[PDB]
Amino acid sequence: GMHPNIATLLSANLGESRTRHLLSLVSVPDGLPSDAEGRATRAEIAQALNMVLFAGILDRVPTGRAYTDDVAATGGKVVFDHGALRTVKWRDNGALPEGEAAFTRILRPLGYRLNGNYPLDRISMTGRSYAHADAPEGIAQFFVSEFHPERFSDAFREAVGRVTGNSADPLTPRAQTLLWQLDRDGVLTVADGAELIGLLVPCFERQHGVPRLADYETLLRESAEMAWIATEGNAFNHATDRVDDVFGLSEQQKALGRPMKDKVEVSGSGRVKQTAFRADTVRRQFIGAQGETVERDVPGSFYEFITRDRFRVDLGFDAG
Template sequence: MPSASSLFANRDQMLYRLLSAVVGEQPATLALTTLAIDPALAGTGDSASRAQVAMALNAALFVDLLDRVPTADRYVQSIRDAGEAIVFDHGALRTIDGETGELPRGHEAFARFLAPLGYEVGGLYPLPALKMTGRAYVQRDLPETIPQFFVSELHVSELPEAAQTACANVFGTSADPLGTAEWQALGALSEHGEASFDEAVTALKGALAAFGRQHEPPALADYEVLLPATKEGAWIATEGNAFNHATTRVANVIALAEELREDGYPMKPSVEISRNGRVRQTAILADKVVRPFREADGAEVPLPVPGSFYEFITRDIDPETGKLDLTFDSGNATGIFAVTRNA
């Protein structure tokens, strides 16, 4: 595995300045001395490129996930103790293709600000068993070294009628975290491919805010309707559009899974292997979190539910292109979704 570098933790580096402005100095230093970062992202100028903003967003989301997922933090600390770096392959989030209040529905809620950061859809992945569709967003400037986003959306219209009503009740209260200032900053990135430091920070803060729960705490009655109909919809009801998982790219995911299992990590029982055999994935089961639910009388009751998790992936070279196979696989994705079902 590559070794971590302190280059990007330098206070003059644009990545450090961006990241510390949104997460603080200590978390920024942690992220930038943990993640393997492409040297092409170095720079100390007055403006930030869209690629730098994209990497800063991923680093901020990585830090946030470590705060919320103790097993992920434990694994990452072990890698830091070994003096190695995390190769951040991709992160994932779940969205609602249905009534979402002020928020654009489905993947469009994220496509609208990922595009100014240089992202485009690199693959479409039907997930019919889950009544979902996944899209892989690839960063055009540095596709192999800036993490992808795997954005899935739940097709509410395919659910039973009672579950559709519950979805409308829950997600219809969603607000839009992006306002005029954020769109002006994103517009600069979209038009020029770079922005001033202040504009980049504004765009970054807005994008980071999108990875949260934009709707009111769900009514317990609605959650109980959603859970048997769509466990993924129930997960979004409590977690919203939070970073569902972060994924480390490793040399041998099968061997690593066995090592982690022996170390006491609650691993997914099997490794998912793509149809072409070049992409292999597994994960630590989701950590539990406590979330509020509204009861009929308006009171809130806290209950434990599945939260986010940490994933591992091995990618082989595509012999036809000679490049790393950056694709995903519908079967793999469907299998990985199961790790948030340990309710």
């Protein structure tokens, strides 16, 4: 249960102390490809990036931090199952590629492949899952959703463009340089891999500026999901922890007085079962009617649990 390459990649991004905690908390899958010269493989880099991003979720999802503090305290483990993020599929997106392209251009050269297509018509989104080709069951998946403004009001679609139309592109030239070297060789030096992770982490964040309170509210009247995107951008919506039994765990967490949701979502097949803590509220800035900065408390992100039956493990996100 030690992984020197992953530990080094983590340490360069998180520092020793935070890395120590993270390595004792989050399982590293066994069997990741290694390089004979001690370089960092794409699998190692992908796993380390995921762990850095997970640590970033914990920093802003206090209910998750509570849960995982107990895990560390009692010697258990987190199995990082997947992070889910949202994107806006709309041409007025500033410098940011539209919808999921903002992230597939990153995940694909890291070694991910499309693993599932999940229409979410009720909420005007399309979801897609990405699994890592080198360890599809062990490395966390990415669930990337795209929001679709087309069917909404005129006012709403104008609001979308004002919010997103100034977005930055966080994927720098150096980031792209290292990404495509990695895709070519399957490895980078450990230093270059650590550097790549550092450059990729800021992509999983809000790329647009502070939105107008009025536009936030216009969005919120028609779509909770697009309102959330307006405040959080491409930051992880949730992280998910793969556990033996979500039913037992939910009951335990509720008995401790923690805010579990009541619904356990079960796929049609019965093999994939999900439940979560409610999202922790976060304080965010908005532009007021006279151009002033005002603040509001809005829903942030959440920590989720999943159980996946084995046939190999069912990696789907099927509807039910």
